[PDB]
Amino acid sequence: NQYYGTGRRKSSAARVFIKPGNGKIVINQRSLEQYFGRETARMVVRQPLELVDMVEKLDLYITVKGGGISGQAGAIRHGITRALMEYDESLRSELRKAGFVTRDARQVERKKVGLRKARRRPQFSKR
Amino acid sequence: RSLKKGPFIDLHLLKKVEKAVESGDKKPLRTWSRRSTIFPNMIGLTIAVHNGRQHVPVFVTDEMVGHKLGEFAPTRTYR
Amino acid sequence: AKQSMKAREVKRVALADKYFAKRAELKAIISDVNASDEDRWNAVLKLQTLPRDSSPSRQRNRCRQTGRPHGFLRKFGLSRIKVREAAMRGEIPGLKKASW
Amino acid sequence: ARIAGINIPDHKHAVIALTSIYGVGKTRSKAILAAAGIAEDVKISELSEGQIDTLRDEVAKFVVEGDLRREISMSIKRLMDLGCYRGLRHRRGLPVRGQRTKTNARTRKGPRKP
Amino acid sequence: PRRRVIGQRKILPDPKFGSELLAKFVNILMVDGKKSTAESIVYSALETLAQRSGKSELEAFEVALENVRPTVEVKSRRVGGSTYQVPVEVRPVRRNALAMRWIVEAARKRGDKSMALRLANELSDAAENKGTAVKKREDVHRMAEANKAFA
Amino acid sequence: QRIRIRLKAFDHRLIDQATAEIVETAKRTGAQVRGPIPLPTRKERFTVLISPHVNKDARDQYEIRTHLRLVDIVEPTEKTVDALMRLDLAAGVDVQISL
RNA sequence: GGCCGGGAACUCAAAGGAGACUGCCAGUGAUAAACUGGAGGAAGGUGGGGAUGACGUCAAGUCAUCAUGGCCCUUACGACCAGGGCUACACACGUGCUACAAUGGCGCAUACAAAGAGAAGCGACCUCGCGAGAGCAAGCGGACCUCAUAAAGUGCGUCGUAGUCCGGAUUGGAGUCUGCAACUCGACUCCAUGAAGUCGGAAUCGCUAGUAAUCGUGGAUCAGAAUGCCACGGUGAAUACGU
Structure with a gap:
């Protein structure tokens, strides 16, 4: 059987399928080390499975598109959390107290008329 | 300016220069055309060029061939 | 704008409509490679005897209601002031104030 | 080593060292070394007399040093004598390629004079 | 501000080790949003520092901090038309912050070849009680001591 | 063969009305259809100065939205095609028929 | 290789609905209005950002967008035409871009976006040229074709603190394209040349979070001419004891 999850961050979307057995992760037809060359990103992707002791018990098949490196990592983490709750349904308290259940709604602020950026003003002189 | 197009000259100036050469002598030739190239067949003549x-x-020599007529008649005054 | 400038524009458009095909032919000759090298010279000498106002680059866009030469928008045929007046009166279909 | 009437350094790579001649830049340096058959990252102190003579023969094919200086000087003198717009600019000391003069122009004018 | 209360932002721990102090150090060292460069510099420095002393990187780091933390400082007051220096106590978060800032500022001013080498040298000197960071701590304490009459 | 219908408008209630009308006329003439598919809306934007003279801030910003729909008829017949070609709809909708 | 048969689950597209109200718990307070904390929940107390500008003030700005009372000129203060000027240059001030370097310069090769425009238009594949480009020619009024290859990043080498393999003003030679026409006065390409400048006196400016700082991308005006203006996303901080 399969358990599914959807995850989102800044501009990215991630689809996660999980099955039982023999921990192995595949992202966009590549391995974790092939895809993410950043230790921070790897740690972010692995955090929930370290939180619930199932690192060597589940197979993970993932797809992701949009955004950058950090945004994709966060989206994958969100999706894994949701799929794990679908799998068990009694880990919700621990995951919520860790803080992985929340969607992080921080987007980019628009530019505005008369400003150089969202909040930066041009230089002012009195005379 | 592209080389596949040839040099630029004004038709009236070209015809006047031809007539002057064939008829020999010439008092100054008056022109308002500063955008025309200087051809090898002008050497020896006197062309009076507008400046505003x-x-x-301008008395044409052979060191000028290839330039525009306007580069020899300055337009601003400064002291 | 004065009444003479609009007349100038009308005259320019008329001449440029009149002389369209001849200029295309001569420019095709001049641009094409492997020509006689005398036809090219004659074509260059002939392209400059046509009226100056027959070149489409002597034209300037103006507001259709006032004649203003600055602040022109192509979708509407008007300047900024008249665009705003019509938009607030409700005379431009589909247009309204935006936020996002 | 002496090449074109001047001493070129000894502890640099060949491609960088050859750019001490007036008239040789990076592209010409690379072309010269390709014709001579030497690598670009070999120090000049690790060469031999035959190799240096080959380099001299290669460099002889370009206009360098005093010949080039004479060419440029005559170029400018011609315009000054003719008395065209560019010549007048050259002999007044102002910009020649149409730049602004209400402000700036300091590379051609020098420091400010009150 | 005037009528406000501001909470504390959360900070992720380091990926190699598991401390938030080290993450704060990386942040204080970074420039222009380039976190990977700063991480590389810090890890190289800690590696070259642990060999010089035969102990763990975190242990060496703590030994360095304990020689730069301050205890008292001086604020400026002016109500009578003249400026007075008033001694006050520092609290632990500000102690850590000031020590880190001083260490990085001192390291940037050296004359070695690479930033990692400069940082390692500064940390070793601090562990031995030498350098600009320790001098700064001493100057601050001297100024605090000279003004005890105004406590 | 197949018939494709493309509809465009500045107002989505109007466009939906027209689409329902087309689907009904096709379905009552005994031809199977594949329900309307929404396609991305186009947003065009403009920005103007609102003072007859200098002031350079003080602008207004406007928009026009274009809505779009597609309908596919798989097995047409003579009666269905004639009925479609013999229809009139509202005065703000653009309809294009392709065979 | 979503390439082909298929599937309607998932990402996404765009139309109808649901949801957040101090609604529930405990304490404080005038048997109040409200305040401090807690549960659940994607989100909590105005959740984040826009649009929206009271009675009036400064005889504030605009008779050169337009409209208009009163003056003023009509073989002229009204028309038409070619050349020149608005681009000057001893000097003073405002707003910006590029730097003064190893958290970097140069070479090789390799991940990850968003939002837009297009018929006198956007111009693929292929051949020629070192390059700016040129020749011949599909497709597209577009979730289909084209503009169009993101950059900072990551791996491997080299340079070793020098006015330098840092910086790129200025000037000489040779060219391309738009356009009747590039002298005064266009943009871009190749070869050569290689200035000031080693962090800036008294003054002085912006910013409380996906903000400052840093990296690329698109549009209006437009034959051709952005370091300006208006929009889009990537990485991503420090500090707030207090008045």
Whole structure:
């Protein structure tokens, strides 16, 4: 059987399928080390499975598109959390107290008329 | 300016120069055309070129061939 | 704008409509490679005897209601002031104030 | 080593060292070394007399040093004598390629004079 | 501000080790949003520092901090038309912050070849009680001591 | 063969009305259809100065939205095609038929 | 290789609905209005950002967008035409871009976006040229074709603190394209040349979070001419004891 999850961050979307057995992760037809060359990103992707002791018990098949490196990592983490709750349904308290259940709604602020950026003003002189 | 197009000259100036050469002598040739190239067949003549107010006389030598007529009649006054 | 400038524009458009095909032919000759090298010279000498106002680059866009030469928008045929007046009166279909 | 009437350094790579001649830049340096058949990252102190003579023969094919200086000087003198717009600019000391003069122009004018 | 209360932002721990102090150090060292460069510099420095002393990187780091933390400082007051220096106590978060800032500022001013080498040298000197960071701590304490009459 | 219908408008209630009308006329003439598919809306934007003279801030910003729909008829017949070609709809909708 | 048969689950597209109200718990307070904390929940107390500008003030700005009372000129203060000027240059001030370097310069090769425009238009594949480009020619009024290859990043080498393999003003030679026409006065390409400048006196400016700082991308005006203006996303901080 399969358990599914959807995850989102800044501009990215991630689809996660999980099955039982023999921990192995595949992202966009590549391995974790092939895809993410950043230790921070790897740690972010692995955090929930370290939180619930199932690192060597589940197979993970993932797809992701949009955004950058950090945004994709966060989206994958969100999706894994949701799929794990679908799998068990009694880990919700621990995951919520860790803080992985929340969607992080921080987007980019628009530019505005008369400003150089969202909040930066041009230089002012009195005379 | 592209080389596949050839040099640029004004038709009236070209015809006047031809007539002057065939008929020999010439008093200054008056022109308002500062955008025309200087051809090898002008060497020896006197061309009076407009600058905004007056006609400046230029006596053509062979070190000028290939330039525009306007580069020999300045347009601003400064002291 | 004065009444003479609009007349200038009308005259320019008329001449440029009149002389369209001849200029295309001569420019095709000049641009094409492997020509006689005398036809090219004659074509260059002939392209400069046509009226100056027959070149489409002597034209300037103006507001259709006032004649203003600055602040022109192509979708509407008007300047900024008249665009705003019509938009607030409700005379431009589909247009309204935006936020996002 | 002496090449074109001047001493070129000894502890640099060949491609960088050859750019001490007046008239040789990076592209010409690379072309010269390709014709001579030497690598670009070999120090000049690790060469031999035959190799240096080959380099001299290669460099002889370009206009360098005093010949080039004479060419440029005559170029400018011609315009000054003719008395065209560019010549007048050259002999007044102002910009020649149409730049602004209400402000700036300091590379051609020098420091400010009150 | 005037009528406000501001909470504390959360900070992720380091990926190699598991401390938030080290993450704060990386942040204080970074420039222009380039976190990977700063991480590389810090890890190289800690590696070259642990060999010089035969102990763990975190242990060496703590030994360095304990020689730069301050205890008292001086604020400026002016109500009578003249400026007075008033001694006050520092609290632990500000102690850590000031020590880190001083260490990085001192390291940037050296004359070695690479930033990692400069940082390692500064940390070793601090562990031995030498350098600009320790001098700064001493100057601050001297100024605090000279003004005890105004406590 | 197949018939494709493309509809465009500045107002989505109007466009939906027209689409329902087309689907009904096709379905009552005994031809199977594949329900309307929404396609991305186009947003065009403009920005103007609102003072007859200098002031350079003080602008207004406007928009026009274009809505779009597609309908596919798989097995047409003579009666269905004639009925479609013999229809009139509202005065703000653009309809294009392709065979 | 979503390439082909298929599937309607998932990402996404765009139309109808649901949801957040101090609604529930405990304490404080005038048997109040409200305040401090807690549960659940994607989100909590105005959740984040826009649009929206009271009675009036400064005889504030605009008779050169337009409209208009009163003056003023009509073989002229009204028309038409070619050349020149608005681009000057001893000097003073405002707003910006590029730097003064190893958290970097140069070479090789390799991940990850968003939002837009297009018929006198956007111009693929292929051949020629070192390059700016040129020749011949599909497709597209577009979730289909084209503009169009993101950059900072990551791996491997080299340079070793020098006015330098840092910086790129200025000037000489040779060219391309738009356009009747590039002298005064266009943009871009190749070869050569290689200035000031080693962090800036008294003054002085912006910013409380996906903000400052840093990296690329698109549009209006437009034959051609952005370091300006208006929009889009990537990485991503420090500090707030207090008045």
